mmCIF file of C-alpha atoms and ligand atoms in Angstrom:
data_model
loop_
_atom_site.group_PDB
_atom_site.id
_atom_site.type_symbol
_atom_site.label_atom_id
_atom_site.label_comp_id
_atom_site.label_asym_id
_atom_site.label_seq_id
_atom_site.Cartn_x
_atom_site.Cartn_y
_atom_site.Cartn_z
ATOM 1 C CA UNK A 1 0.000 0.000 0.000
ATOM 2 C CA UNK A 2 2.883 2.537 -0.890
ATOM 3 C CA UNK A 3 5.717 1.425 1.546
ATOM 4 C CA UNK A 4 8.612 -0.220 -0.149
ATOM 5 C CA UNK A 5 7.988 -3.711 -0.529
ATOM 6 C CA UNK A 6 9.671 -6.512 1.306
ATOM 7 C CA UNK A 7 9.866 -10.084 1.643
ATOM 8 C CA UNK A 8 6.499 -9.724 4.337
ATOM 9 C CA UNK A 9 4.280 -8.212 1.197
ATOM 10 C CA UNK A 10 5.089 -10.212 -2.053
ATOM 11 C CA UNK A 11 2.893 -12.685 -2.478
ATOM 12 C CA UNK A 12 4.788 -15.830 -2.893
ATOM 13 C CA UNK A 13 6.135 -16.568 -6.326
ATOM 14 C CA UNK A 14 5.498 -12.765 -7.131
ATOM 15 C CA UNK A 15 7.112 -9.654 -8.004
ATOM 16 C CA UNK A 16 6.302 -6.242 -7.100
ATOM 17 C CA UNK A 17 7.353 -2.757 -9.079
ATOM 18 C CA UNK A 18 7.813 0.870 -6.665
ATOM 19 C CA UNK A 19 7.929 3.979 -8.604
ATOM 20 C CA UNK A 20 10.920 5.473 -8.475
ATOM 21 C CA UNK A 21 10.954 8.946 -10.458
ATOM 22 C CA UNK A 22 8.851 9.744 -13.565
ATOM 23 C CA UNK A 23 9.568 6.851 -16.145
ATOM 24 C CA UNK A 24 11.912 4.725 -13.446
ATOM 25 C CA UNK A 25 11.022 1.938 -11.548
ATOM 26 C CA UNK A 26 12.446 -0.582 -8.830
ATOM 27 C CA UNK A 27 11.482 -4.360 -9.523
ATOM 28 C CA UNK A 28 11.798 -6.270 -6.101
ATOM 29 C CA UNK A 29 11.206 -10.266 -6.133
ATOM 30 C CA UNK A 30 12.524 -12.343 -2.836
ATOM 31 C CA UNK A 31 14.433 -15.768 -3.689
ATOM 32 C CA UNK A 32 15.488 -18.857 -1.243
ATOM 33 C CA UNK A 33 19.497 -19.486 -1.130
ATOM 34 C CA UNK A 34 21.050 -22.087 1.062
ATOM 35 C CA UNK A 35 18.181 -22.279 3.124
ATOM 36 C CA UNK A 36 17.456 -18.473 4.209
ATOM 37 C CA UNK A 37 15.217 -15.761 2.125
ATOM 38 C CA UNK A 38 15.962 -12.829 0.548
ATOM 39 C CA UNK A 39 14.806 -9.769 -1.241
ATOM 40 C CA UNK A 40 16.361 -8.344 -4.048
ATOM 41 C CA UNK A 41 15.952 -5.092 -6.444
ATOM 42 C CA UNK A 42 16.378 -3.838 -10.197
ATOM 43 C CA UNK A 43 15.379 -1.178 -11.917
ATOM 44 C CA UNK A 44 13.031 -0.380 -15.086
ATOM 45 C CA UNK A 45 13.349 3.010 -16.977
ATOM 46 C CA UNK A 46 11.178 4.225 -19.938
ATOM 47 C CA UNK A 47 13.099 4.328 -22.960
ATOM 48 C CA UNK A 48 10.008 6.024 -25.238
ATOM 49 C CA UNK A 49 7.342 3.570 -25.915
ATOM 50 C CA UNK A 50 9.997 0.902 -24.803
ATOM 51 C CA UNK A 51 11.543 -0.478 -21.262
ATOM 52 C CA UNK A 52 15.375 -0.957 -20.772
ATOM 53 C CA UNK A 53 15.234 -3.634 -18.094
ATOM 54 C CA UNK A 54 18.424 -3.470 -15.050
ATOM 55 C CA UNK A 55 18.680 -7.342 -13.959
ATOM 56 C CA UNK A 56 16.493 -10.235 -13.460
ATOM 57 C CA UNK A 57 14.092 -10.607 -10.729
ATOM 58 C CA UNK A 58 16.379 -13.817 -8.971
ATOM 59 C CA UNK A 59 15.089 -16.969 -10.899
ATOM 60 C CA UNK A 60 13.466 -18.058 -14.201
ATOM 61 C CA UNK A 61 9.752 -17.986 -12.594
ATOM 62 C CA UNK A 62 10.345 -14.917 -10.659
ATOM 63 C CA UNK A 63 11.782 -13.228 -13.676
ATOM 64 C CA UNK A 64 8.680 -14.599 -15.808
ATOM 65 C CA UNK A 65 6.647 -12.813 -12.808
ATOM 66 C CA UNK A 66 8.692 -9.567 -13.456
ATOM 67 C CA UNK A 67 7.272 -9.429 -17.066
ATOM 68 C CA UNK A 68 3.697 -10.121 -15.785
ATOM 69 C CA UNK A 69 4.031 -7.799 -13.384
ATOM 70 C CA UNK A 70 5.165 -5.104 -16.324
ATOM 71 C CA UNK A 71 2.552 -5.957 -18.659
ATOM 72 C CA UNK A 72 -0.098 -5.441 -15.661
ATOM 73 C CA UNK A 73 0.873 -2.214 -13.927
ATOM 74 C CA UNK A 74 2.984 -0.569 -17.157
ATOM 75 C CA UNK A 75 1.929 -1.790 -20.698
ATOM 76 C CA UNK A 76 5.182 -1.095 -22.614
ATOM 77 C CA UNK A 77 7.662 -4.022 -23.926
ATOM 78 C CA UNK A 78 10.426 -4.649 -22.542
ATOM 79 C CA UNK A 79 13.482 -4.644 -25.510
ATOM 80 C CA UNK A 80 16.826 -4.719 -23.449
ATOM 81 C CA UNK A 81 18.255 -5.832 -20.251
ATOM 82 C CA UNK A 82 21.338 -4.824 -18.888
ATOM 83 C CA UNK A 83 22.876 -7.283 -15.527
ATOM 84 C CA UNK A 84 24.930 -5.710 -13.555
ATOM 85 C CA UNK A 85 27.343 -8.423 -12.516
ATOM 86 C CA UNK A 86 27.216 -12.507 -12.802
ATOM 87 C CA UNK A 87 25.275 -13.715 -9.713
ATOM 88 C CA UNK A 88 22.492 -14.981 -10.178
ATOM 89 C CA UNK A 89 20.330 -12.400 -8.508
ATOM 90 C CA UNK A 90 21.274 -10.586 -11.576
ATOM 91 C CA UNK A 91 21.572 -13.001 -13.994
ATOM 92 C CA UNK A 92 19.265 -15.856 -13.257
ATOM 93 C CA UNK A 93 16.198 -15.289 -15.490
ATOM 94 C CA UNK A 94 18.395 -14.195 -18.818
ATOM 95 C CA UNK A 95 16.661 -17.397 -20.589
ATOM 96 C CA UNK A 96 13.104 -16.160 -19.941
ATOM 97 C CA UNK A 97 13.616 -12.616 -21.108
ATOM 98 C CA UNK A 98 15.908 -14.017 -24.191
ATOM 99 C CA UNK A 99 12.224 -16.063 -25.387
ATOM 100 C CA UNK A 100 9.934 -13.135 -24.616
ATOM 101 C CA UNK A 101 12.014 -10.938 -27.111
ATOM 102 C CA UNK A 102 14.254 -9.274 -24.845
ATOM 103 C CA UNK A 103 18.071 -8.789 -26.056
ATOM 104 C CA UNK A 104 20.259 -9.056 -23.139
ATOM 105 C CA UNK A 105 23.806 -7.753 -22.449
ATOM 106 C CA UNK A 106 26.151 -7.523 -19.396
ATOM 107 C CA UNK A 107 30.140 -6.789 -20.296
ATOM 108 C CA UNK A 108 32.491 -9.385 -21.448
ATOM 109 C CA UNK A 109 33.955 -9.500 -17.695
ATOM 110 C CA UNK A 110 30.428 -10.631 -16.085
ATOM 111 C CA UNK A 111 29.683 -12.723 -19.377
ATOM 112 C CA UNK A 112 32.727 -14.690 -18.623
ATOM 113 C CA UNK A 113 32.237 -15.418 -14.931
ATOM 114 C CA UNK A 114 28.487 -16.107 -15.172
ATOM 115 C CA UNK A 115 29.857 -19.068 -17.914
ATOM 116 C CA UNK A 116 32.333 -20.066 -15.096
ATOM 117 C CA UNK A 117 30.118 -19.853 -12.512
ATOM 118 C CA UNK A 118 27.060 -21.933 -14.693
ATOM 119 C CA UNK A 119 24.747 -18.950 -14.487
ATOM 120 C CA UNK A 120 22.979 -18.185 -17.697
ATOM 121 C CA UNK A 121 24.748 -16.282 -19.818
ATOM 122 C CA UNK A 122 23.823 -12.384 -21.648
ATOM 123 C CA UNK A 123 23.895 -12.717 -25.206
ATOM 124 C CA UNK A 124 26.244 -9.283 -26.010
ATOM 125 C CA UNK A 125 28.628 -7.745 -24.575
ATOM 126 C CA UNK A 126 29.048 -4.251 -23.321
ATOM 127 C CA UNK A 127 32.845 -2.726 -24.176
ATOM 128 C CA UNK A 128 34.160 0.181 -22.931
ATOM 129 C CA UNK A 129 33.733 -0.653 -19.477
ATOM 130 C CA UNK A 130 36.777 -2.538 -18.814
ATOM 131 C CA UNK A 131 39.215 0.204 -16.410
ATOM 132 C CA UNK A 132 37.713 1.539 -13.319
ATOM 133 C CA UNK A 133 35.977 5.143 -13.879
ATOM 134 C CA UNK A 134 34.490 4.123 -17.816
ATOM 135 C CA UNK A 135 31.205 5.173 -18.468
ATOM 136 C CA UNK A 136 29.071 4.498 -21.606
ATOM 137 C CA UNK A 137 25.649 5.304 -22.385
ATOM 138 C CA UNK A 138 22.689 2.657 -22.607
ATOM 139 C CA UNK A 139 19.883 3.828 -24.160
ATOM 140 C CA UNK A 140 18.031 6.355 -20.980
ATOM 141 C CA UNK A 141 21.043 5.573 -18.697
ATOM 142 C CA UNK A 142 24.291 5.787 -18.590
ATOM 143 C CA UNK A 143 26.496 2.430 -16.996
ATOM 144 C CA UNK A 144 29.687 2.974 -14.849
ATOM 145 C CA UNK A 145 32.765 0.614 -13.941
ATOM 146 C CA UNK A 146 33.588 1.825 -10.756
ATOM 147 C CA UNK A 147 35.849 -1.066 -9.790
ATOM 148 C CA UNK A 148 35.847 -4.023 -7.883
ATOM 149 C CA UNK A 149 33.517 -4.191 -4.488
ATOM 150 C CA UNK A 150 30.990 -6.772 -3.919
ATOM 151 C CA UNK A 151 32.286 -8.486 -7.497
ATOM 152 C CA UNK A 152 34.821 -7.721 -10.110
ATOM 153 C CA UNK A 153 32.629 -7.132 -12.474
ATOM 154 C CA UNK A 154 30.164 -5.033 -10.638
ATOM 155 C CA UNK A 155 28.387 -1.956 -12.214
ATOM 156 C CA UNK A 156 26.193 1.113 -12.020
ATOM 157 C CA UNK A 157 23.221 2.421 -13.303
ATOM 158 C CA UNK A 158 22.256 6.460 -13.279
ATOM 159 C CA UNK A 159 19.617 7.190 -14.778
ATOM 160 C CA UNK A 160 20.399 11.149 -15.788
ATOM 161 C CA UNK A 161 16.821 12.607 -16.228
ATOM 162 C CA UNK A 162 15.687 11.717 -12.746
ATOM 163 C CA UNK A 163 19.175 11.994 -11.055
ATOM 164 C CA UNK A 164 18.518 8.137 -9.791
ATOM 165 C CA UNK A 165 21.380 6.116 -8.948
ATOM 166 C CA UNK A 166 21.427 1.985 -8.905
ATOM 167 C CA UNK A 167 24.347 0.968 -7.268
ATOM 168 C CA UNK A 168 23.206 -2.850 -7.565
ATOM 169 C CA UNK A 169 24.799 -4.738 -5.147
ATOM 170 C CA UNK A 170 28.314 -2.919 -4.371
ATOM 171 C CA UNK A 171 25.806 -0.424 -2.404
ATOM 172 C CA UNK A 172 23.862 -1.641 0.743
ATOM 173 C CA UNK A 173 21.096 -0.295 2.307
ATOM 174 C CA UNK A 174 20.963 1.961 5.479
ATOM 175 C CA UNK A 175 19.923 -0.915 7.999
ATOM 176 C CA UNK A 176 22.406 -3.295 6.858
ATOM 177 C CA UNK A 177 24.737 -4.559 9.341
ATOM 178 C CA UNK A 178 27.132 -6.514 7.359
ATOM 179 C CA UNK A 179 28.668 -6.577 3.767
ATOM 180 C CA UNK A 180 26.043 -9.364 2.596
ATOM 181 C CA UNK A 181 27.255 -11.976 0.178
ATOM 182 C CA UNK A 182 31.813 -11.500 0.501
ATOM 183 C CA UNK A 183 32.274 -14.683 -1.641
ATOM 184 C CA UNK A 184 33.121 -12.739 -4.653
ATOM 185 C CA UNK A 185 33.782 -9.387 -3.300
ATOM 186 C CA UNK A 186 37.397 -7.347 -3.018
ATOM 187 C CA UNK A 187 37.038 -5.880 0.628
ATOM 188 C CA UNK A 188 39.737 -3.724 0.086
ATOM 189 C CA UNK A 189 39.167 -2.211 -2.852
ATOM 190 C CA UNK A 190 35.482 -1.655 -2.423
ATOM 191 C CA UNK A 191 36.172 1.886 -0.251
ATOM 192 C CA UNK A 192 38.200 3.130 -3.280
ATOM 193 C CA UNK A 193 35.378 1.738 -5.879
ATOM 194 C CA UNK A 194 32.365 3.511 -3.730
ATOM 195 C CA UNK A 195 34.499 6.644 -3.570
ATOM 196 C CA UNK A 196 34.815 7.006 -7.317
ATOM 197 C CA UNK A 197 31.299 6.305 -7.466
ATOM 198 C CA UNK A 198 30.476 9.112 -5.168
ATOM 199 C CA UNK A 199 32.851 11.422 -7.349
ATOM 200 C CA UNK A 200 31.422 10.631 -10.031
ATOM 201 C CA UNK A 201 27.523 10.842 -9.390
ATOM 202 C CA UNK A 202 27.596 13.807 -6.507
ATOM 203 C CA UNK A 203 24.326 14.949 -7.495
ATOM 204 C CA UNK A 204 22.434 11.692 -7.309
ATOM 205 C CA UNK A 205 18.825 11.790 -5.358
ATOM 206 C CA UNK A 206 17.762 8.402 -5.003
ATOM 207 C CA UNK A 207 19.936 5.687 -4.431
ATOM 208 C CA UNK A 208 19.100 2.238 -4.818
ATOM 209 C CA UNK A 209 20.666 -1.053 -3.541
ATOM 210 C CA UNK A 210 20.759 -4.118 -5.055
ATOM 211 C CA UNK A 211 18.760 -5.468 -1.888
ATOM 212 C CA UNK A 212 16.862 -3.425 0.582
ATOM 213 C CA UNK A 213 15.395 0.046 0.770
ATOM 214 C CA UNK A 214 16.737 2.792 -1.611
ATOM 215 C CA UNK A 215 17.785 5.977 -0.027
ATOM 216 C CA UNK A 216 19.830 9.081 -0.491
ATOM 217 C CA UNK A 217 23.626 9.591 -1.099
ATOM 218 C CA UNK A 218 24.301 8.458 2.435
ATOM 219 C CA UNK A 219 24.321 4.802 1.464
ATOM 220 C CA UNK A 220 27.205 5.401 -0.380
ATOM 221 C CA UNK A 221 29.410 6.175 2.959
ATOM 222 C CA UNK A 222 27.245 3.099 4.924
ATOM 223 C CA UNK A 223 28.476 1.100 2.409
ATOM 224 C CA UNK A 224 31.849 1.703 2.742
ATOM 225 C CA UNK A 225 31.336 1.947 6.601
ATOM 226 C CA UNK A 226 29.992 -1.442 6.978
ATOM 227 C CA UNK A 227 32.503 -3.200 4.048
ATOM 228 C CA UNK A 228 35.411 -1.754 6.102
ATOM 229 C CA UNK A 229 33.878 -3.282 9.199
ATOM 230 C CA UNK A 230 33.718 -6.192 7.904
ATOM 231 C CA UNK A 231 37.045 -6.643 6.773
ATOM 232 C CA UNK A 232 38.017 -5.596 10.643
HETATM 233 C C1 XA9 B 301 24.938 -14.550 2.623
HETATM 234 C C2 XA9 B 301 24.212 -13.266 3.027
HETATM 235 O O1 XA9 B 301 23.992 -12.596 1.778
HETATM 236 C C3 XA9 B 301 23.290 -11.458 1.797
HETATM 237 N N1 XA9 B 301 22.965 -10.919 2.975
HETATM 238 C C4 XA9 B 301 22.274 -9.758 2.978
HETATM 239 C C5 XA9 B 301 21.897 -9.154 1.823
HETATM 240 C C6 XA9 B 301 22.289 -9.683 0.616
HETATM 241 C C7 XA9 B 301 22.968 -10.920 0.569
HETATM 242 C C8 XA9 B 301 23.332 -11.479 -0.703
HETATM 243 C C9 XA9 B 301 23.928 -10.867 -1.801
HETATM 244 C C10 XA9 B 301 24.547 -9.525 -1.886
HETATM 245 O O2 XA9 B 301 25.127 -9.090 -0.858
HETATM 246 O O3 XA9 B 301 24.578 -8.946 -2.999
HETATM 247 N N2 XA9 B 301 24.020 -11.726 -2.850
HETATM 248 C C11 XA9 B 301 23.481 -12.960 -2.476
HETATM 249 C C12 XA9 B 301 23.429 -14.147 -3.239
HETATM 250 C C13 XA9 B 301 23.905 -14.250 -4.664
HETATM 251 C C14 XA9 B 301 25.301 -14.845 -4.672
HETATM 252 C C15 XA9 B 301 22.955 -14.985 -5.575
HETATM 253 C C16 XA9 B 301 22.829 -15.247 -2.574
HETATM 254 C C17 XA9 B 301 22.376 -15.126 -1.247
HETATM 255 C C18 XA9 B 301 22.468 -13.931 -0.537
HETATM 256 C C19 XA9 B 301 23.062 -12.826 -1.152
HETATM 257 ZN ZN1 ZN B 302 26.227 -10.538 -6.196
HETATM 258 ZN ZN1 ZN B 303 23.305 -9.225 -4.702
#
């Protein structure tokens, strides 16, 4: 009823959208992993009578959920889908949207260790990315290597007309109390990745994590806070 949603209101099996800005959206979907439950986020932006989908909703029938979900409370198609690193909170789902039309792309970096890993696998690959501090624009967004944090390959989304930042999941909400999932992650170099990011987007408004509650620019700092706490 207007809060953000959490793993206490989707209905089982479902997916819910929050409106973000004009023409930007948060998908949030809640998956089981090693025997505990978990939300997670992405983002849809209006791209003229089109949708530029940022990740899967966690999952093949959550993601097939996601596109329900769109078709119900949007009515535009979905044509592209960007995932913003190789786990499979980002990734898992890439099937489904590859048969309902949607071309999907992640850079050559994720591409390769979601093929290592045996998560599905983007069909193109995103260039320019490659060195810490590249940008490149993506239809209504623009997409930002800020280095290695929570995975090598990890990257941003800022959406410029709404001043929206998705920091996926090298950013971590304001009530978390630990740096999530490490396996993949470079504790030491995340501090240096989230300060480029906060150089680099220093007018950002909303700020969205890849799980959790989206807030201002302060999750930037909690982030680091909380990674560097972690590695203490
Ligand atoms: C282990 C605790 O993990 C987390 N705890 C709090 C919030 C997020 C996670 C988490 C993340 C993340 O931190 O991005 N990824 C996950 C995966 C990925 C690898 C699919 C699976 C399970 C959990 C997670
Ligand atoms: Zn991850
Ligand atoms: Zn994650």
């Amino acid at each position: 009823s207007g809060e953000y949603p959490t793993v206490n209101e989707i209905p089982v099996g479902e997916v819910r959208l929050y409106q973000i800005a004009d023409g930007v959206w948060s998908h949030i979907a809640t998956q089981s992993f090693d025997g505990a439950v978990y939300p997670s986020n992405g983002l849809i932006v209006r791209d003229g009578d089109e949708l530029l989908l940022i990740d899967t909703a966690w999952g093949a029938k959550n993601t097939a959920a996601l596109l329900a979900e769109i078709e119900k409370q949007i009515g535009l198609p979905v044509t592209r889908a960007v995932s913003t690193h190789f786990h499979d909170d980002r990734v898992g789902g890439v099937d489904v949207l590859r048969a309902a039309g949607v071309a999907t792309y992640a850079s050559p970096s994720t591409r390769r260790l979601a093929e290592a890993e045996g998560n599905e696998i983007p069909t193109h690959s995103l260039e320019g990315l490659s060195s810490s501090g590249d940008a490149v624009r993506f239809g209504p967004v623009e997409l930002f290597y800020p280095g290695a944090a929570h995975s090598t390959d990890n990257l941003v989304v800022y959406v410029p007309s709404a001043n929206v930042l998705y920091g996926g999941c090298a950013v971590h909400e304001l009530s978390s109390t630990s740096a999530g999932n490490v396996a993949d992650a470079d504790l030491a170099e995340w501090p240096t990745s989230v300060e480029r990011i906060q150089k680099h987007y220093p007018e950002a408004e909303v700020v969205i994590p890849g799980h959790g509650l989206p807030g201002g620019l302060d999750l930037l700092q909690h982030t680091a806070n909380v990674v560097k706490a972690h590695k203490n």
